[PDB]
Amino acid sequence: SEIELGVTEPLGVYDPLGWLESEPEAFERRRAVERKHGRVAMAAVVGTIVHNNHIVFDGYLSPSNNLKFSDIPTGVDGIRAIPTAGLAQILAFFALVELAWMPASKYDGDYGVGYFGTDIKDPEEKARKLNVELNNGRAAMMGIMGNMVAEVLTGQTMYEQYASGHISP
Amino acid sequence: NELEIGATAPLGVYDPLGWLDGEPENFERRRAVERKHGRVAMAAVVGTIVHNNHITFDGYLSPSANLKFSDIPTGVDGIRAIPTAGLLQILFFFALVELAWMPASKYDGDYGVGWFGSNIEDPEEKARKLNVELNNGRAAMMGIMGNMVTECITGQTMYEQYAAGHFSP
Amino acid sequence: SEIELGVTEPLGVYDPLGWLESEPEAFERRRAVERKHGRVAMAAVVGTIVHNNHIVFDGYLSPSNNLKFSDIPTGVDGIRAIPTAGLAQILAFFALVELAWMPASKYDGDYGVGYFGTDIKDPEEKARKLNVELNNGRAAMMGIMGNMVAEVLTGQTMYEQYASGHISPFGDGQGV
Amino acid sequence: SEIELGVTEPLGVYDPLGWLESEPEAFERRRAVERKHGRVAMAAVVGTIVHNNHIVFDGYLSPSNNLKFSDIPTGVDGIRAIPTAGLAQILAFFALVELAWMPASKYDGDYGVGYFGTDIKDPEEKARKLNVELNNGRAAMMGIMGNMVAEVLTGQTMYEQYASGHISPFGD
Ligand code: CLA
Ligand code: CLA
Ligand code: CLA
Ligand SMILES: CC(=O)O[C@H]1CC(C)(C)C(=C=C/C(C)=C/C=C/C(C)=C/C=C/C=C(C)/C=C/C=C(\C)C(=O)C[C@@]23O[C@]2(C)C[C@@H](O)CC3(C)C)[C@](C)(O)C1
Ligand SMILES: CC(=O)O[C@H]1CC(C)(C)C(=C=C/C(C)=C/C=C/C(C)=C/C=C/C=C(C)/C=C/C=C(\C)C(=O)C[C@@]23O[C@]2(C)C[C@@H](O)CC3(C)C)[C@](C)(O)C1
Ligand SMILES: CC(=O)O[C@H]1CC(C)(C)C(=C=C/C(C)=C/C=C/C(C)=C/C=C/C=C(C)/C=C/C=C(\C)C(=O)C[C@@]23O[C@]2(C)C[C@@H](O)CC3(C)C)[C@](C)(O)C1
Ligand code: KC1
Ligand code: KC1
Secondary structure, three states: OOOOOOOOOOOOOOOOOOHHHHOOOOHHHHHHHHHHHHHHHHHHHHHHHHHHOOOOOOOEEEOOOOEEHHHOOOOHHHOOOOOHHHHHHHHHHHHHHHHHHOOOOOOOOOOOOOEOOEOOOOHHHHHHHHHHHHHHHHHHHHHHHHHHOOOOOOOOOOOHHHHOOOOOO | OOOOOOOEOOOEOOOOOOOOOOOOOOHHHHHHHHHHHHHHHHHHHHHHHHHHOOOOOOOEEEOOOOEEHHHOOOOOOOOOOOOHHHHHHHHHHHHHHHHHHOOOOOOOOOOOOOOOOOOOOOOOHHHHHHHHHHHHHHHHHHHHHHHHHHHHHHOOOOOOOOOOOOOOO | OHHHOOOOOOOOOOOOOOHHHHOOOOHHHHHHHHHHHHHHHHHHHHHHHHHHOOOOOOOEEEHHHOEEHHHOOOOOOOOOOOOHHHHHHHHHHHHHHHHHHOOOOOOOOOOOOOEOOEOOOOHHHHHHHHHHHHHHHHHHHHHHHHHHHHHHOOOOOHHHHOOOOOOOOOOOOOOO | OOOOOOOOOOOOOOOOOOHHHHOOOOHHHHHHHHHHHHHHHHHHHHHHHHHHOOOOOOOEEEOOOOEEHHHOOOOOOHHHHOOHHHHHHHHHHHHHHHHHHOOOOOOOOOOOOOEOOEOOOOHHHHHHHHHHHHHHHHHHHHHHHHHHHHHHOOOOOHHHHHHOOOOOOOOO
16 A cells, blocks of 8 residues: 555665654655655656756747747756746646646546556556655655755856866865 | 546536437447547647648659649648549548448447557556547547638648747737 | 458458368468468568668678678569578578477467567457458568569569659559 | 576476586576576677677767777777776676665566566466576577687677678688
8 A cells, every 4th residue: 555655675664753653644645745746856857867968959949039949058047047928838737737637636646647558457566666656756856956956056057067077076 | 338438527428419318329429420530630630730840751742743742731731732643542542441441330439459459458547548539539629620720810821820920819 | 269360351251262171171281371471471561662762771781792782672683682692691590490499380370479579368359460460461462472573574673663653554453 | 486497499408417406405596697697698798789880979988088988999808998987886886786776685586677567477478588588698698708709819809800701710
C-alpha cells in the first residue's frame, strides 16, 4: 500500500521528525505533495540539461516582443524573460491540468495514464516502480536546488560554469 | 458496453435532443458515426499541422502535371490541387479500406487492430481509452471545422495567418 | 490450429486443387513452405523498395574489387554483382541459420521469438496476427514475382521505370 | 531454476572438468561470475564496434589535458589515454553500482530491472531469454579476447586492420 512506497534499503523508514506517528492522518497529503514536488523537480532537472545544451526551438517565442527562443537565458533568468502574455498562457493551460484533467486535489497520484500508458499488474513490480518515482523525485528535488544555488551564488549559468572550469569549490 | 463509453466526467451523459431516451435502436449507428467522424477529423487536424509546418515529401507529386509537393497549398485548396488521376487512387484504395478491410458497416468499431495491435485486457482502462478516442475525436471535429471556417473567412492558410498576426476577430 | 490459420474473409478455405483432403498429411510441411516463402518474399519486397530508394551503406562492399555499395544495381542483377567470395559468406551464415539456429525442418516456424519478442497469449488475437503473416506473405509473393518480371521485361530497375514514366505496359501488365 | 539455465543445443550440459558434481556447492557463485563476465564482455564487444566505427562524443574529454574524444585510440590502449583523474571518476561511480545499487553480492543476477523493464512470466519464455543472455555472454567473452589478442598480434586496431585488408592469417 501507500505508506510502504517510500522506503528503500539504505535508510528504511526515514522519519527523523517522527511525524508518521505524530501526524498519521496527514501522511496522505504529504505523500501526495512529495510525489508532486518530485514530478515537478524531475521535469526541472531534465529541463536544465536541455536549456544548457543549447537545444532551442529555432524560431521566435514572441514576434511582437522581438524575442527569439535563443534570446532567453538558460539558467535562473529564463522564466523571467518570458512575456507576461506568455506566462498568462502557461497559467491558463496548467490551470486546466491542475484542476480538471489531472487534478492535484486527487491525492492518489494515479491518473488515467499509467507507466507509459501501462498498468503494472505485478504488485512487487508496481511498488518497485512507485519507489523509483519517489526516489528519483527526491534526488531531483535536492538536485534542482543544487542547480539554482549554483547560479544565485555564482552569477553564472550551468553552461559556462563548465566552460570556464568554475566547478572548483 | 457502448452505452456509457461516450459519457465523460464534466458533462456526464449529454443529450440535449434526448435521443438516448428517444430512439434507443439508432444509438449503435450514431455511435458508429461519431467514432468514425472522430477518427477522420483527428487525422485531419494532424494533417493541417503537418501541412502548415511545411513538412513535405521532397519530390514531384505529379511530374506529368509538374506538381511538386511544395506546390500544393496547405489550406482547403490543397485537396483540389491534386490531379484527377491522383484523387481516384485515393478514392479506389479507400474503397478497399471502407468496404473490405475495415468495413464501415461494422458499427462495433474494432476491425482487427487494437491499441497498437493489442487488446487492453482490462475493462476499466480500455473503457478509459475508448473515452479518449471519442473525446479527442469530438474536440478534433470542432477543431477541423474551426480550421476550415477561418481558412475561408480570412482567405489565408494557417501559415499565412501566424505570419500576419491574425489572432483577434 | 494450423489448419485454420490461412483462412480469412473473402475466400475462406481456398484450395482449387483440393489437397486439404486429398493429401491431409502433406499439409503441415506445405504450410511451413508457404510461411517460409512468405517470410522470404516479404523481406524481398521491402528490400526492393529500399534498394530503389537509393538507401546505400556509404562505403565499399569489396575494396579488393573497387566495388562500392552504390555501384551495385538496384534491380534483379543486384546479387549477380556481389563477388563470389561475398556470396560464400551469405550462404555460410544462412547455413547456420537455416539448419541450426532457426532450422527450416521445424515445420511450425516457432523458433524462439514471438511477435517482437512477445508471446501473444490471446488465442483469437494470436490467430489474427498469424493470419496477417500468411496474408502479407501471400501478397508479397505475388508482389516480388510481379516486380521481378516487370524488370526483365522492361530492362529497367524500379527506379528507372519510375524515372522514364514507364508504368504503362509496353508488354502486357497485370496489377491491382 | 539455475542448474538448467546454461543448457542449450548441441552441447547440452558441458563440463569437461566435471565441476557440476565435483563442486555442487560453488555453482551459485560460479554462475553469478559467468553471468557477470558475460554482461561485462557483451558491453565490451559492442564497445569495440562503436569505437572502431568512429562514433565519438564531438567535444573534449579532458580540456585540462587538452584531450578530445577523437584523440583517444580506438583499440586496447583507449583506457590508458584517459587521465587518472577521470578514470577515478568511473571507479567511484561503479563502486556505487557494484556495492550499493546492483550489488554483485547478489548471486542471482536479478535486480529491480527486468528484460527492458518487464518481468517474463511464461517460464520458458524467461528461460529462453536467460539462456540467450548466457550464450551471448559466453560468445562475447570469446569475442572480446579474440579482439584483444588479434590486435596485439598485428599492432593495428580493428579499424586499421580491416582497412589494410589484414583479415586472412598470413603472418600467423
Ligand atoms: C517536498 C517536500 C517533501 C515532503 C512533503 C516529504 C514527505 C515525506 N517524506 Mg520525503 N524527502 C524529500 C522531500 C519531501 N518529503 C526530499 C527532497 C528527500 C531527499 C533528501 C526526502 C527523503 C525521504 C526519505 C529517505 C524518506 C522520506 C519520507 C517522507 C514521508 C515521511 C512522513 C513524514 O511526515 O516525514 C517528515 C516530514 C517531511 C520529511 C516533510 C516536511 C518538509 C519540511 C518541513 C521541509 C523543511 C525545509 C527543508 C529543511 C529545506 C531543505 C531544502 C534545502 C536542503 C535546500 C513524508 C510523506 C519517508 C517515507 O516516505 O517513508 C514511508 C522516508 O523513508 N523522505
Ligand atoms: C458525427 C456527429 C456526431 C454524432 C452522430 C454524435 C452522436 C452522439 N453523441 Mg455527440 N458529439 C459530437 C458529434 C456527434 N455525436 C461533437 C462534435 C461533440 C463535441 C461538441 C459531441 C459531444 C457529445 C457529448 C459530451 C456526448 C455526446 C453523446 C452522443 C450520443 C448520444 C445520442 C445523442 O445525443 O443524439 C443526439 C444527436 C446527435 C448528438 C447528433 C445528431 C446530428 C445533429 C442533430 C446535427 C446538428 C449539427 C449542426 C447542423 C451543425 C453543427 C454546428 C457546428 C458545430 C458546426 C450519440 C451517439 C453522449 C454520449 O455519448 O453518451 C454515452 C454524450 O455524453 N456527444
Ligand atoms: C509458396 C507456395 C505456396 C504453398 C506451398 C501454399 C500452400 C497452401 N496454401 Mg497458399 N497461397 C500462396 C502460396 C502458397 N501456398 C500465394 C502466393 C497465395 C496468394 C495468391 C496463396 C493464397 C492462398 C489462400 C487464400 C489459401 C491458401 C491455402 C494454402 C494451403 C492449402 C492446402 C492446399 O491444398 O493448397 C493447394 C496447394 C498449393 C497452394 C501448393 C501448390 C503449388 C503450385 C502447384 C505451384 C505452381 C504455381 C504456379 C507456378 C504459379 C504461377 C503464377 C505466379 C508466378 C504468379 C496450403 C498450405 C489455404 C489455406 O491456408 O487453408 C488452410 C487458403 O485458404 N493459399
Ligand atoms: C502526464 C502524462 O501523461 O505522463 C504520462 C506519459 C509519460 C511522460 C510518457 C510517462 C513517463 C515516464 C517519465 C516521465 C520518465 C522521466 C523521468 C524523469 C524526468 C526523471 C528525472 C530524474 C532526475 C534526477 C534523479 C536528478 C538528480 C540531480 C543531481 C544528482 C544533481 O546534482 C543536479 C544537477 O544540476 C546539478 C546540481 C549539478 C550538475 O553537475 C549535474 C546536474 C545537472 C544533474 C508517465 C509519467 O508514466 C505518464
Ligand atoms: C507498439 C504498438 O502499438 O504496435 C505497433 C507495431 C505494429 C504491431 C507493427 C503495428 C502495425 C502495422 C504497420 C506499422 C504497418 C506499416 C506498413 C508499411 C510501412 C507499408 C509500406 C508500404 C510502402 C510500399 C509498398 C512502397 C512502394 C513503392 C514505391 C513508393 C516506389 O517504388 C516509388 C519510389 O520508390 C521510388 C521508385 C523512387 C523514389 O525516389 C520515390 C519513390 C519512393 C516514390 C501497429 C498495430 O500499427 C502498432
Ligand atoms: C487503421 C489502423 O490500423 O490503426 C491502428 C494502428 C495505430 C495507428 C498505430 C493505432 C493508434 C493510435 C493513434 C491513431 C493515435 C493518434 C490520435 C490522434 C490523431 C489524435 C488527434 C487529436 C486532435 C485534436 C483533439 C484537435 C483539436 C483542435 C483544436 C482544439 C483546434 O483549435 C484546431 C486548430 O486548427 C486550429 C483551429 C487553431 C489552432 O490554434 C490550434 C489548431 C491548429 C490545433 C490504432 C488506432 O490503435 C490502430
Ligand atoms: C556529477 C557530475 C559530474 C561533473 C560536474 C563531472 C566533471 C568532470 N568530469 Mg566527470 N564523470 C561523471 C560525472 C561528473 N563529472 C560520471 C557520472 C562519469 C562516469 C562514471 C564521469 C567520467 C569521467 C571521465 C572518464 C572523465 C571525466 C572528466 C571530468 C572533468 C572534465 C573537466 C576537465 O578535465 O578539464 C570535470 C571535472 C575528465 C577528467 O577528469 O579529466 C582530468 C575525464 O577524463 N569524468
Ligand atoms: C501501387 C503502387 C502505386 C504506383 C506505381 C503509383 C504511381 C503513381 N501515382 Mg499513386 N498512389 C498509390 C499507389 C501507387 N501509385 C496509393 C496506394 C495512393 C493513395 C491511396 C496513391 C495516391 C496518389 C496521388 C494523390 C497521386 C498519385 C500519383 C501517381 C503517379 C505519379 C504521377 C505521374 O507518373 O504522372 C504514379 C504513376 C499522382 C498522379 O496520379 O498524377 C497524375 C498523384 O497526384 N498517387
